[PDB]
Ligand binder design. Structure first.
Ligand SMILES: NC(=O)[C@@]1(O)CCN(c2ncnc3[nH]ccc23)C1
Ligand SMILES: [Cl-]
Length: 167
């Protein structure tokens, strides 16, 4: 039993809710919140910009030190950093950004990072400003993640379409 509330159950391990991931994180304080990161951990917009804003830019400061030490992530890769005031940990996961021409096949690799964590709050990878079809992102999620994932979908109209079209 965990403290996630109001989710629709899609499968054995995947749950979905129309919610602002920032407000969800501030309520639940999960062990892991997933950020929709880019390889430079530049949290300018989308989910990343919103999560960083909620940390008062502390996520960006920590991220800049990480990059200065380690260099950029790989597309499809991840790193674990602090969750600041939102969660214990933030798993920064880089899905492909279609608006950069990145290979959508790397989306499965991106979701594989979730399997290293027993429970996660997460957005749909490569959705929103990353330019992939969110229906496809959901299918890959369900077919790749085996740990317990609670998906927050900010857009209510998008949330309704994802549920109704789910196979
Ligand atoms: N005032 C705010 O910060 C927002 O209400 C608008 C920006 N922000 C988000 N921007 C993009 N993608 C997102 N996914 C989940 C939340 C979210 C929250
Ligand atoms: Cl985003």
């Amino acid at each position: 039993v965990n403290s996630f509330s109001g989710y629709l159950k899609l499968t054995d391990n995947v749950y979905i809710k129309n919610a602002d991931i920032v407000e969800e994180a501030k309520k639940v304080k999960p062990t892991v919140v997933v950020n929709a990161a880019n390889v430079y951990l530049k949290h300018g917009g989308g989910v990343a910009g919103a999560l960083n804003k909620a940390t008062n830019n502390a996520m960006q400061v920590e991220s800049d030190d990480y990059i200065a030490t380690n260099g950029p992530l790989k597309v499809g890769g991840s790193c674990v950093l602090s969750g600041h005031n939102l969660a214990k940990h933030c798993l920064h996961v880089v899905g492909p950004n279609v608006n950069k021409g990145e290979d959508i096949q790397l989306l499965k690799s991106a979701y594989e990072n979730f399997n290293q964590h027993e429970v996660l709050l997460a957005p749909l990878l490569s959705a929103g400003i990353f330019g992939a079809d969110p229906i496809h992102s959901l299918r890959v999620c369900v077919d790749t993640v085996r740990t317990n994932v609670y998906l927050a979908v900010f857009d209510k109209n998008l949330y309704d379409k994802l549920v109704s079209s789910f196979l």
